[PDB]
Design a protein around this nucleic acid. Structure first.
Ligand SMILES: [Mg+2]
Ligand SMILES: [Mg+2]
Ligand SMILES: [Mg+2]
Ligand SMILES: [Mg+2]
Ligand SMILES: [Mg+2]
Ligand SMILES: [Mg+2]
Ligand SMILES: [Mg+2]
Ligand SMILES: [Mg+2]
Length: 209
RNA sequence: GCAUGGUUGUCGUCAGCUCGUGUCGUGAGAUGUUGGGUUAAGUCCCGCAACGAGCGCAACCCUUGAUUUUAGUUGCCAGCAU
Protein backbone atom coordinates (compact mmCIF):
# COMPACT_ATOMS: atom_id res chain seq x y z
CA UNK A 1 0.00 0.00 0.00
CA UNK A 2 1.42 3.35 1.11
CA UNK A 3 4.95 3.92 2.42
CA UNK A 4 3.76 4.23 6.04
CA UNK A 5 1.92 0.97 6.83
CA UNK A 6 4.35 -1.58 5.43
CA UNK A 7 6.40 -4.54 6.58
CA UNK A 8 10.20 -4.17 6.58
CA UNK A 9 10.40 -7.96 6.19
CA UNK A 10 9.55 -7.34 2.53
CA UNK A 11 12.22 -4.82 1.58
CA UNK A 12 13.58 -7.39 -0.86
CA UNK A 13 10.50 -7.09 -3.07
CA UNK A 14 10.21 -3.28 -3.18
CA UNK A 15 11.84 -1.37 -6.03
CA UNK A 16 12.28 2.42 -6.05
CA UNK A 17 9.36 4.55 -4.88
CA UNK A 18 6.85 6.64 -6.80
CA UNK A 19 5.33 9.74 -5.26
CA UNK A 20 2.83 8.33 -2.78
CA UNK A 21 3.44 4.57 -2.56
CA UNK A 22 6.06 1.88 -3.10
CA UNK A 23 6.67 0.14 -6.43
CA UNK A 24 7.05 -3.64 -6.50
CA UNK A 25 9.66 -5.11 -8.81
CA UNK A 26 8.12 -7.42 -11.39
CA UNK A 27 10.95 -9.82 -12.29
CA UNK A 28 10.85 -11.35 -8.82
CA UNK A 29 7.08 -11.60 -9.27
CA UNK A 30 7.35 -13.48 -12.56
CA UNK A 31 9.89 -15.88 -11.08
CA UNK A 32 7.64 -16.39 -8.05
CA UNK A 33 4.51 -17.00 -10.14
CA UNK A 34 6.38 -19.45 -12.38
CA UNK A 35 7.49 -21.33 -9.27
CA UNK A 36 3.94 -21.20 -7.88
CA UNK A 37 2.53 -22.60 -11.13
CA UNK A 38 5.09 -25.41 -10.95
CA UNK A 39 4.14 -26.21 -7.35
CA UNK A 40 0.41 -26.10 -8.05
CA UNK A 41 0.99 -28.48 -10.96
CA UNK A 42 3.00 -30.75 -8.67
CA UNK A 43 0.28 -30.80 -6.02
CA UNK A 44 -2.96 -30.76 -8.05
CA UNK A 45 -2.60 -34.20 -9.69
CA UNK A 46 -2.95 -36.14 -6.45
CA UNK A 47 -6.73 -36.81 -6.25
CA UNK A 48 -6.71 -34.19 -3.46
CA UNK A 49 -7.96 -30.61 -3.36
CA UNK A 50 -6.89 -26.96 -3.26
CA UNK A 51 -8.76 -24.51 -1.04
CA UNK A 52 -9.62 -20.94 -2.04
CA UNK A 53 -10.14 -18.24 0.60
CA UNK A 54 -11.73 -15.04 -0.73
CA UNK A 55 -11.21 -12.56 2.11
CA UNK A 56 -11.97 -9.25 0.38
CA UNK A 57 -14.74 -8.47 -2.10
CA UNK A 58 -12.46 -8.62 -5.14
CA UNK A 59 -11.24 -11.95 -3.81
CA UNK A 60 -14.87 -12.86 -3.11
CA UNK A 61 -16.07 -12.75 -6.70
CA UNK A 62 -12.74 -13.88 -8.16
CA UNK A 63 -12.37 -17.04 -6.08
CA UNK A 64 -16.07 -17.88 -6.41
CA UNK A 65 -15.85 -17.75 -10.20
CA UNK A 66 -12.48 -19.53 -10.38
CA UNK A 67 -13.52 -22.34 -8.02
CA UNK A 68 -16.78 -22.90 -9.89
CA UNK A 69 -14.85 -23.01 -13.16
CA UNK A 70 -12.30 -25.47 -11.75
CA UNK A 71 -14.74 -27.44 -9.58
CA UNK A 72 -12.54 -26.98 -6.51
CA UNK A 73 -13.47 -26.12 -2.91
CA UNK A 74 -13.61 -22.54 -1.67
CA UNK A 75 -14.71 -20.26 1.14
CA UNK A 76 -16.14 -16.89 0.16
CA UNK A 77 -17.93 -15.18 3.07
CA UNK A 78 -16.57 -14.65 6.58
CA UNK A 79 -14.18 -17.43 7.61
CA UNK A 80 -15.69 -18.77 10.81
CA UNK A 81 -12.90 -20.02 13.03
CA UNK A 82 -12.18 -23.71 13.42
CA UNK A 83 -13.04 -25.18 10.01
CA UNK A 84 -9.56 -26.72 9.74
CA UNK A 85 -9.40 -27.67 13.38
CA UNK A 86 -12.97 -28.31 14.59
CA UNK A 87 -13.60 -30.28 11.43
CA UNK A 88 -15.87 -32.66 13.36
CA UNK A 89 -18.25 -29.85 14.32
CA UNK A 90 -18.09 -28.35 10.82
CA UNK A 91 -18.93 -31.69 9.23
CA UNK A 92 -21.80 -32.14 11.69
CA UNK A 93 -23.16 -28.77 10.60
CA UNK A 94 -22.85 -29.58 6.90
CA UNK A 95 -24.54 -32.94 7.49
CA UNK A 96 -27.36 -30.97 9.11
CA UNK A 97 -27.48 -28.81 5.98
CA UNK A 98 -27.63 -31.79 3.62
CA UNK A 99 -30.37 -33.47 5.65
CA UNK A 100 -32.54 -30.36 5.87
CA UNK A 101 -32.12 -29.66 2.15
CA UNK A 102 -33.03 -33.25 1.28
CA UNK A 103 -36.10 -33.31 3.51
CA UNK A 104 -37.32 -29.91 2.29
CA UNK A 105 -36.80 -30.86 -1.36
CA UNK A 106 -38.31 -34.35 -1.14
CA UNK A 107 -40.48 -35.23 1.83
CA UNK A 108 -43.37 -32.85 2.46
CA UNK A 109 -42.35 -29.15 2.11
CA UNK A 110 -44.85 -28.66 4.96
CA UNK A 111 -44.18 -30.15 8.39
CA UNK A 112 -47.27 -29.16 10.40
CA UNK A 113 -47.44 -25.47 11.42
CA UNK A 114 -46.76 -22.17 9.67
CA UNK A 115 -43.36 -22.12 11.37
CA UNK A 116 -41.06 -22.85 8.43
CA UNK A 117 -40.65 -19.22 7.32
CA UNK A 118 -40.01 -17.80 10.79
CA UNK A 119 -36.85 -19.75 11.51
CA UNK A 120 -36.42 -22.88 9.39
CA UNK A 121 -35.73 -20.86 6.21
CA UNK A 122 -33.70 -17.92 7.53
CA UNK A 123 -31.26 -20.15 9.41
CA UNK A 124 -30.85 -22.43 6.39
CA UNK A 125 -30.14 -19.41 4.19
CA UNK A 126 -27.60 -17.99 6.64
CA UNK A 127 -25.84 -21.33 7.06
CA UNK A 128 -25.72 -21.87 3.29
CA UNK A 129 -24.22 -18.39 3.00
CA UNK A 130 -21.50 -19.03 5.59
CA UNK A 131 -20.50 -22.57 4.63
CA UNK A 132 -20.75 -22.60 0.84
CA UNK A 133 -17.98 -24.73 -0.64
CA UNK A 134 -17.51 -26.79 2.53
CA UNK A 135 -20.59 -28.80 1.52
CA UNK A 136 -18.34 -30.79 -0.84
CA UNK A 137 -15.03 -30.87 1.08
CA UNK A 138 -14.59 -34.58 1.73
CA UNK A 139 -11.34 -34.46 3.70
CA UNK A 140 -8.54 -32.03 4.54
CA UNK A 141 -7.33 -29.33 2.13
CA UNK A 142 -3.84 -29.75 0.74
CA UNK A 143 -2.90 -26.13 -0.02
CA UNK A 144 -4.83 -23.01 0.94
CA UNK A 145 -4.93 -19.96 -1.32
CA UNK A 146 -5.35 -16.54 0.30
CA UNK A 147 -5.71 -13.18 -1.42
CA UNK A 148 -4.80 -10.88 1.49
CA UNK A 149 -2.81 -12.77 4.15
CA UNK A 150 -2.97 -9.97 6.73
CA UNK A 151 -6.76 -9.72 6.41
CA UNK A 152 -7.07 -13.49 6.97
CA UNK A 153 -4.89 -14.20 10.01
CA UNK A 154 -7.25 -16.84 11.42
CA UNK A 155 -7.11 -19.03 8.31
CA UNK A 156 -3.32 -18.90 7.99
CA UNK A 157 -2.95 -19.65 11.71
CA UNK A 158 -5.30 -22.63 11.48
CA UNK A 159 -3.44 -23.97 8.45
CA UNK A 160 -0.01 -23.46 10.01
CA UNK A 161 -1.05 -25.27 13.19
CA UNK A 162 -2.07 -28.30 11.11
CA UNK A 163 1.10 -27.85 9.00
CA UNK A 164 -0.22 -27.82 5.44
CA UNK A 165 1.29 -25.70 2.63
CA UNK A 166 -0.02 -22.21 1.92
CA UNK A 167 0.13 -20.18 -1.29
CA UNK A 168 -1.02 -16.58 -1.48
CA UNK A 169 -0.33 -13.08 -2.73
CA UNK A 170 1.43 -10.89 -0.16
CA UNK A 171 1.14 -7.13 -0.57
CA UNK A 172 3.76 -4.82 0.96
CA UNK A 173 1.76 -4.75 4.23
CA UNK A 174 2.17 -8.43 5.17
CA UNK A 175 4.78 -10.69 6.75
CA UNK A 176 5.98 -13.26 4.16
CA UNK A 177 6.92 -15.99 6.63
CA UNK A 178 3.56 -17.15 7.96
CA UNK A 179 2.77 -18.10 4.36
CA UNK A 180 5.37 -20.66 3.37
CA UNK A 181 5.53 -19.94 -0.36
CA UNK A 182 4.83 -16.45 -1.61
CA UNK A 183 4.16 -14.27 -4.65
CA UNK A 184 4.39 -10.45 -4.25
CA UNK A 185 1.25 -8.87 -5.69
CA UNK A 186 -1.26 -6.10 -4.99
CA UNK A 187 -4.37 -7.54 -3.31
CA UNK A 188 -6.46 -4.39 -3.74
CA UNK A 189 -7.34 -4.10 -7.46
CA UNK A 190 -9.93 -6.49 -8.87
CA UNK A 191 -7.94 -6.95 -12.08
CA UNK A 192 -4.76 -8.49 -10.66
CA UNK A 193 -6.45 -10.91 -8.25
CA UNK A 194 -8.56 -12.24 -11.12
CA UNK A 195 -5.49 -12.85 -13.28
CA UNK A 196 -3.52 -14.59 -10.52
CA UNK A 197 -6.38 -16.79 -9.31
CA UNK A 198 -7.28 -17.70 -12.90
CA UNK A 199 -3.65 -18.65 -13.55
CA UNK A 200 -3.62 -20.87 -10.46
CA UNK A 201 -6.87 -22.58 -11.48
CA UNK A 202 -5.62 -23.03 -15.04
CA UNK A 203 -2.41 -24.63 -13.80
CA UNK A 204 -4.44 -26.96 -11.57
CA UNK A 205 -6.68 -27.94 -14.50
CA UNK A 206 -3.77 -28.44 -16.90
CA UNK A 207 -1.89 -30.66 -14.46
CA UNK A 208 -4.94 -32.59 -13.23
CA UNK A 209 -6.66 -33.21 -16.58
C1' G B 1 -32.12 -32.30 61.19
C1' C B 2 -24.63 -30.02 62.07
C1' A B 3 -24.35 -38.14 60.79
C1' U B 4 -28.81 -38.84 56.47
C1' G B 5 -33.34 -40.37 52.54
C1' G B 6 -39.30 -37.46 50.99
C1' U B 7 -40.80 -29.00 52.39
C1' U B 8 -43.99 -23.33 53.88
C1' G B 9 -41.81 -15.45 54.12
C1' U B 10 -38.06 -11.78 50.45
C1' C B 11 -35.04 -9.75 46.53
C1' G B 12 -38.86 -11.21 42.61
C1' U B 13 -41.45 -13.99 37.74
C1' C B 14 -35.69 -11.21 39.15
C1' A B 15 -33.20 -13.35 34.08
C1' G B 16 -29.88 -15.70 34.96
C1' C B 17 -26.58 -21.08 35.72
C1' U B 18 -23.09 -24.06 32.75
C1' C B 19 -21.08 -28.46 29.50
C1' G B 20 -18.65 -30.73 24.69
C1' U B 21 -15.06 -29.76 20.58
C1' G B 22 -11.89 -25.81 19.63
C1' U B 23 -8.38 -21.92 20.17
C1' C B 24 -5.48 -17.84 23.76
C1' G B 25 -2.34 -18.03 28.49
C1' U B 26 3.91 -21.08 32.09
C1' G B 27 -0.52 -21.23 35.37
C1' A B 28 -5.07 -20.30 38.19
C1' G B 29 -8.14 -19.19 34.14
C1' A B 30 -10.24 -16.63 29.55
C1' U B 31 -13.31 -16.80 24.98
C1' G B 32 -18.38 -18.48 23.68
C1' U B 33 -22.03 -15.49 27.87
C1' U B 34 -17.66 -8.95 25.41
C1' G B 35 -19.67 -4.63 21.27
C1' G B 36 -24.34 -1.79 18.35
C1' G B 37 -29.43 -2.20 18.22
C1' U B 38 -33.95 -4.82 20.05
C1' U B 39 -37.28 -7.53 23.74
C1' A B 40 -41.51 -8.62 29.02
C1' A B 41 -36.59 -12.14 28.91
C1' G B 42 -29.09 -15.01 27.56
C1' U B 43 -35.97 -13.37 23.01
C1' C B 44 -33.72 -12.07 18.42
C1' C B 45 -30.31 -9.78 14.17
C1' C B 46 -25.28 -8.08 12.62
C1' G B 47 -20.10 -8.04 13.26
C1' C B 48 -16.77 -10.94 16.15
C1' A B 49 -11.86 -16.86 17.53
C1' A B 50 -15.28 -19.50 17.82
C1' C B 51 -19.10 -23.88 16.29
C1' G B 52 -23.01 -26.35 18.96
C1' A B 53 -25.57 -27.66 23.22
C1' G B 54 -28.56 -28.69 28.45
C1' C B 55 -31.64 -26.26 32.84
C1' G B 56 -33.99 -21.68 32.63
C1' C B 57 -37.45 -17.61 29.41
C1' A B 58 -41.04 -19.48 25.56
C1' A B 59 -44.66 -23.25 23.84
C1' C B 60 -47.45 -27.93 25.54
C1' C B 61 -51.73 -26.71 30.50
C1' C B 62 -56.65 -24.37 32.82
C1' U B 63 -60.40 -20.99 32.75
C1' U B 64 -62.54 -16.86 30.62
C1' G B 65 -64.06 -14.05 25.98
C1' A B 66 -66.89 -15.72 19.69
C1' U B 67 -68.64 -19.37 16.34
C1' U B 68 -69.89 -24.65 13.70
C1' U B 69 -71.31 -29.91 14.34
C1' U B 70 -73.08 -33.53 17.63
C1' A B 71 -77.08 -34.12 21.84
C1' G B 72 -82.40 -32.29 24.09
C1' U B 73 -84.37 -33.34 30.46
C1' U B 74 -84.91 -31.77 35.48
C1' G B 75 -82.71 -26.70 30.84
C1' C B 76 -85.43 -23.20 27.49
C1' C B 77 -90.95 -21.29 24.79
C1' A B 78 -90.46 -19.22 18.94
C1' G B 79 -94.27 -21.07 16.31
C1' C B 80 -99.36 -24.12 18.86
C1' A B 81 -103.09 -24.70 21.83
C1' U B 82 -103.71 -24.20 27.69
MG1 LIG C 1 -2.90 -4.54 -0.37
MG1 LIG D 1 -22.07 -29.93 59.07
MG1 LIG E 1 -37.99 -23.13 51.65
MG1 LIG F 1 -44.08 -14.87 56.26
MG1 LIG G 1 -30.60 -8.19 46.75
MG1 LIG H 1 -0.52 -23.80 25.46
MG1 LIG I 1 -22.75 -15.46 33.90
MG1 LIG J 1 -25.56 -8.71 24.07
Amino acid sequence: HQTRRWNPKMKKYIFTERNGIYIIDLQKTVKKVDEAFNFMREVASDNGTILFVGTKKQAQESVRDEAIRSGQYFVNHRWLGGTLTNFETIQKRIQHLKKIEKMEADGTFEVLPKKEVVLLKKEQEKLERFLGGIKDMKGLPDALFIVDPRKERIAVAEARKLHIPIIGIVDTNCDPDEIDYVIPANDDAIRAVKLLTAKMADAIIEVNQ
